[PDB]
Amino acid sequence: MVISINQVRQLYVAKALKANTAALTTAGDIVPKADTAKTTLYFQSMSPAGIVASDKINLKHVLYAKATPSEALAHKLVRYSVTLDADVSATPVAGQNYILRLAFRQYIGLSEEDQYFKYGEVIARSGMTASDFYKKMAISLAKNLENKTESTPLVNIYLISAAAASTDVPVTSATKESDLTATDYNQIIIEETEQPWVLGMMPQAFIPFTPQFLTITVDGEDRLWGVATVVTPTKTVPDGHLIADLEYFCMGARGDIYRGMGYPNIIKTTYLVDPGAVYDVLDIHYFYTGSNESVQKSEKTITLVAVDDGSHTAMNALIGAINTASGLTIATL
Amino acid sequence: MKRVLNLGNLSRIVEGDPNEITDDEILVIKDKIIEGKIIDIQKRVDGKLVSLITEKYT
DSSP states (O other): OOOOOSSOOEEEEOSEEOSSGGGOOSTTEEEEEEOSSSSEEEEEEEETTEEEEOOOEEGGGEEEEEEOOSSTTOOBOOEEEEEEOTTTOSSOOTTOBOOEEEEEESOSSSSSSOEEEEEEOOBOOTTOOHHHHHHHHHHHHHHHHOOSSOOSOOOEEEEEETTTSSOOEEEOTTOOGGGOOOSOEEEEEEEOOOOOOBTTTBOOOOOOEEEEEOEEEETTEEEEOEEEEEEOOOOBOOSHHHHHHHHHHHTSTTSOSSSSSSSTTOOOOOOOOOBTBOEEEEEEEEEEEOSSSOOOEEEEEEEEEEEOOSSOHHHHHHHHHHHHHHOOOOOOO | OOOSSOHHHHTTEEOSOGGGOOSSSEEEEEOSSSSSOEEEEEEESSSSEEESSOOOOO
């Protein structure tokens, strides 16, 4: 998860807020320090290897300072709703191959020229009601998607009974028609997947898809048999991994930039972000100017991250202390 | 036993929209619920699209 920096970006984790530097005992403790006036701002950050302190911010040269509510970083899993097109026919027509084409973008590569396609097949029979078609279609998708010898997990198939309308029922390549017993299956849902993630190696990413349909011959003409709707999602990624990869990257601006390259001959760096939690982020921008001829600026970013208990309590405590010690008015969350 | 119509009049047995069926062509309406069965054979007479199968009751 390499990012772009305005001449630098630094990160410090706030696992606990203290009043003085004589109280920085634990390896996440932080405290904002500033003059009795308002001339410089810096933070005393307790590292796993002793106290440290951020760069010194000239408060005449603070450009912007703003926090985030920890929900602007969650990625909602793109959810779809497949259905028979009533216009063509509200039921399958016997003797027709109701194929479905799942077009995938951002497959192994990172561009969209990198595409991948996965199909489903359902040959309709006489008396094949709609629920049975969705059942057999979902199963064909699962089977063709998750063959035990298929590396990447691409999508999660689901089904919804018109009775519930909310509780989506899963469909795996291990699922059997015997397990799907209802008869009022209204539609087929398809959803994204949290691809595998590795700290510093494999960034948080997703494979976008769109269900594309194939033509069938209804009364005399070739027509698409379904409808691919983009319904509102219900599942998110909790932002834990973005911050972890952010710290991993932003602690090389403050230390070992090799992070394992010459393996036996490396430095071991500790990280205080728990990937599995959810964080609210504070970010400060500023710059440094020199004297007579050295007027050029050097803009900088000092970044903080706290833990979101759902009420933005810790990040609010930070902002309170920073504004009390700096005269700033960073808006609370 | 012999063929029912010259292939010229059989090549005009089509499968489509009832609104686009003129004369010099016969229409077949395939059945959906049933695979091979047919619903009706139709032939236009005076703008109306009438059936050639005689209605049969109990």
